[PDB]
Design a protein around this ligand. Structure first.
Ligand SMILES: CCCCCCCC/C=C\CCCCCCCC(=O)O[C@@H](COC(=O)CCCCCCCCCCCCCCC)COP(=O)([O-])OCC[N+](C)(C)C
Length: 626
């Protein structure tokens, strides 16, 4: 039924014989590898992954209070926030959004798709459940679009409930406008900034950052050369201890002199300028930027004057040189990151199709689902767990000026890059590979009938259902275990030597919850779910289990482990924006597929284009106008 008779039926079904049937793989030599691995893979992947959940959560119960304490590491030594009841509330509102999605979806769409004809002669073939709803003629293909709109309206709504709970605390009057003007001179800005009827306080023209580097280095070096002069019961190997005073020398000589040599050069460098025009005229000036004091308009501050940044934040270090140099750096960084995305996604996609190439081979040779549907999705989960961090490092090396801005950009970029990898790259690559497969299966010499009717995805959508299942199970497992972390803790304390240091380590492993990266992970998976939902119904049921198992793993993690944190209220709103993005990406994938298939000028695709266009437009309004 699932491993025995299973293959038998598929092996010998259709065999041409199309009095009227469309099947898809009708032109088959008995069978074709392009058919599909059993039920899609969902059976074997679920078992292998639910086993893994039940392994990882059985290697947590054992390690919680053992392994030093990487379980409760926060309930140990010196409730969880208000910026956590918000994250948990987002999670809850998404649980309910997806419960509704699941219900509606499953019911309506599973029936709609199952009433198909293509990919239907096969009994068990994830495909019958996906979009194998004929092409035209099936009027039901309109339903998909009308249900997609139900999903955007639903997510606008359920997210609004969430945003009617995250109380923007009447925050941002920061009378400190910035600038980006010409080098040289200062009091001329202490003339034009005055304009007329304006009460400035100060100016301060930004300079450089070599000093900043040395300082932090010297302070950390100081930490070393001071504290590590103890060792053999002295005071803040043995040969290293006898060279630690020379390393202390290094700090107090090289770096020290170096420090002072930077003030030597401070005045030399010149960049832009902040200004402390206080009161409320800030607005006036920021709005103007204009003419007023033309006497003092050599450089006309022909550069942006952009409110403030609040001294605490402004990464003085990264005031590169603005303009050209900064954006080129940005370009470089983002492009390397994109080529990396390509690399990872490629490996996983090709593992997944490394059987369905020669499309003339019998369905026998389709590779066990655990080398086409588990291993691929696990590698993608894995390489999509490095992305959170590589994106962080990238953000740093882009010289983002404002530090809060850097935090939010980190959130948005983890989102973009993750969404990308998973959803997008696989979708594009797989759909392209299927166009390819359907060329090579519908070669038939000059019959260029690459029936773009059955070109959905190589596995008919299973790659992503399996990514979601994988995620849910294995990932909630690994967020509960946080294996990489237990490993560090362990070793850090295996070489703790003294129990003083032990205490130190335990009193240190207690990261404040990063409600930035986590919002993003959750939302990348929510995006996969919603996007493929109306076009691969089964993903939602196996996705409510993701968010239900993440509300659960986070109500553990955000209490037992992970320290209380407080974030800019902006990070919660970026999440709401990203879920709205998920439903719009769903409408967009419905479009892409109704364009590959179903032509490009038929009612179906046109309806979905209309909605897509309108939605992108109203969204643009709320971005610009508001
Ligand atoms: C008590 C101690 C004993 C523990 C026993 C239990 C052992 C496990 C048993 C069961 C669960 C199985 C887990 C497998 C996934 C491993 C990932 C990993 O650990 O690293 C990390 C991710 O990933 C990486 O950083 C490296 C990834 C490289 C690829 C290797 C993947 C393995 C498959 C290769 C196939 C070869 C090619 C196949 C060719 C056909 C995990 O980190 P994280 O959880 O993502 O958390 C950080 C980020 N996050 C929180 C934001 C998400």
């Amino acid at each position: 039924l699932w491993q025995s008779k299973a293959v038998s039926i598929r092996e010998q079904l259709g065999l041409g014989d199309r009095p009227n049937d469309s099947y898809c793989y009708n032109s088959a030599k008995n069978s074709t590898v392009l058919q599909g691995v059993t039920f899609g893979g969902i059976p074997t992947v679920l078992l292998i992954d639910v086993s893994c959940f039940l392994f990882l959560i059985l290697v947590f119960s054992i390690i919680r209070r053992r392994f030093w304490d990487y379980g409760r590491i926060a309930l140990v030594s010196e409730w969880c926030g208000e910026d956590a009841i918000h994250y948990l509330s987002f999670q809850r509102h998404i649980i309910f959004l997806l419960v509704v999605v699941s219900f509606l979806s499953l019911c309506v769409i599973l029936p709609v798709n199952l009433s198909g004809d293509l990919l239907d002669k096969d009994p068990y073939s994830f495909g019958r459940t996906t979009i194998a709803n004929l092409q035209t003629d099936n009027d039901l293909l309109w339903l998909h679009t009308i249900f997609a709109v139900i999903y955007l309206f639903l997510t606008v709504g359920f997210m609004r409930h969430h945003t009617q709970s995250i109380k923007y605390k009447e925050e941002n009057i920061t009378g400190l406008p910035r600038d980006a003007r010409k080098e040289t001179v200062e009091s001329h800005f202490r003339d034009a900034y005055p304009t007329c009827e304006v009460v400035d306080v100060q100016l301060c023209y930004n300079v450089a950052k070599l000093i900043y580097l040395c300082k932090e280095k010297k302070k950390t070096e100081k930490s070393l050369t001071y504290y590590t002069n103890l060792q053999v019961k002295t005071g803040q190997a043995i040969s290293y201890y006898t060279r630690m005073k020379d390393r202390l020398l290094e700090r107090i000589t090289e770096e020290e002199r170096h420090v002072q040599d930077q003030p030597l050069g401070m005045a030399f460098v010149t960049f832009q300028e902040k200004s402390m025009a206080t009161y409320i005229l800030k607005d006036f000036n920021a709005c103007k930027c204009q003419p007023s004091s033309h006497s003092r308009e050599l450089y006309t501050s022909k550069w942006t004057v952009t409110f403030a940044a609040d001294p605490e934040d402004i990464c003085w270090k990264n005031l590169s040189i603005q303009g050209l140099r900064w954006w080129l750096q940005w370009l470089g960084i983002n492009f390397t990151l994109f080529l990396g995305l390509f690399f990872l996604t490629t490996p996983s996609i090709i593992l997944s199709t490394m059987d369905k190439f020669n499309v003339t081979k019998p369905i026998h040779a389709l590779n066990n689902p655990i080398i086409s549907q588990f291993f691929p999705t696990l590698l993608l989960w894995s390489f999509s767990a490095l992305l959170p961090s590589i994106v962080y490092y990238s953000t740093l090396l882009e010289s983002h000026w404002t530090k809060s801005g850097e935090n939010q950009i980190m959130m948005t970029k983890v989102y973009i890059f993750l969404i990308f990898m998973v959803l997008i790259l696989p979708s594009l690559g797989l759909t392209s590979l299927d166009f390819f497969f359907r060329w090579l299966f519908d070669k038939t010499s000059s019959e260029a009938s690459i029936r773009l009717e059955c070109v959905f995805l190589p596995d008919q959508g299973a790659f992503f259902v399996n990514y979601v299942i994988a995620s849910a199970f294995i990932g909630n497992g690994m967020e509960l275990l946080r294996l990489p972390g237990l490993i560090l803790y362990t070793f850090r304390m295996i070489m703790a030597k003294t129990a003083a240091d032990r205490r130190n380590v335990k009193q240190n492993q207690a990261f404040q919850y990063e409600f930035g990266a986590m919002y993003a992970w959750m939302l990348c998976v929510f995006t996969v779910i919603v996007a493929y939902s109306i076009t691969c119904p089964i993903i939602a049921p196996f996705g409510l289990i993701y968010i239900l198992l993440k509300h659960m793993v986070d109500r553990h993690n955000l209490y037992f482990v992970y320290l209380p944190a407080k974030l800019e209220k902006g990070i919660h709103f970026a999440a709401v924006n990203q879920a709205l993005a998920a439903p719009i990406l769903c409408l967009f994938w419905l479009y892409f597929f109704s364009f590959l298939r179903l032509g490009m000028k038929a009612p179906a695709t046109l309806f979905t284009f209309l909605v897509l266009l309108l939605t992108i437009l109203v969204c643009l309004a709320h971005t610009c106008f508001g």
